[model samples]
Target: EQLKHCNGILKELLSKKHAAYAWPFYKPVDASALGLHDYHDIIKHPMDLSTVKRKMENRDYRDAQEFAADVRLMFSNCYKYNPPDHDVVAMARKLQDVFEFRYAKMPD
Candidate 1:
């Protein structure tokens, strides 16, 4: 979360009109550990999520963490935060965030 704040600063300095703020990045995409080998097929540019995941899936835990951090930094300022905390839908989202984070950290 701290690093995410730094990344937001860098992004704001580089571009934009109103100053932007970074926050927790939530995506619909998956970054399975097996995704590393798929980069050649998915990436269009550096830090591109699909491509990065391909390479990230092949990396060690530290690298994976860095990659995820980098991604969070990239999208934190741009990613929309839609709090799903209204009812059952919100409950499901909370469940998903916890499970997904745990799943992502698991070693293959």
Candidate 2:
């Protein structure tokens, strides 16, 4: 099936980071600890930029500094509507909400 091919390509790309199709990173940022991040293809955000901003804003700085990691997908609801493709920028921008809400949900 086409999906199988896409997956295959992705796996292969992951195997070769130099291929230029590799994902963000192997280290996935958990979402349950944070919450829902309303991500959409239209929402514009640069990866590195938002990551820093997300960390800057945290809710659980109780006794220690709480960290907010970008790409923490509390809920990947977008995929429910549409599946992902080979688009890297689209994927990255969509995931930005993961970082946006990390601080957006924080106690201000």
Candidate 3:
């Protein structure tokens, strides 16, 4: 739940007058863990809920805690958060702040 709060910053920063954000990052999209593979195929073709669920099960998560986080993150991939100002660097810094906050609270 705390990890979600991090989105607040992204939401705020991304919603700025000139900022923009997008999912399906420029970097690689690893659906292997999410049980997804071909990005374009998934986008072009209809989603196979079976694949998502199967991947979730195949992951054989260690516990609910681990499964819970990955589930949310996997779902989050469906949306794109664009920045209003195109300030990628600034947006990155703010995102870092959120990550730091979330990471600090994690148990050792």
lDDT per model, in order? 0.37, 0.35, 0.40
C-alpha TM-scores of all predictions? 0.26, 0.25, 0.27
Backbone clash total, candidate 2: 0
Instruction: State how far residue 19 of model 3 sits from its true place (Å).
Output: 9.4
> Clashes in each model (backbone N, CA, C under 3 Å)?
4, 0, 12
Give the Cα error of residue 16 in candidate 3, in Å: 13
lDDT score of residue 63 within candidate 1? 35
Q: How does model 3 score by TM-score? A: 0.27
The candidate maximizing lDDT is 3
Q: Write the residue-wise lDDT of candidate 2 on 2-27 in tens digits.
A: 33332332243235433342234333
86-106: candidate 3 lDDT, tens digit per residue: 454354444445444544565
lDDT of 2: 0.35
Model 3: residues with Cα > 4 Å off, grouped in runs: 1-86
Candidate 3 has an lDDT of 0.40
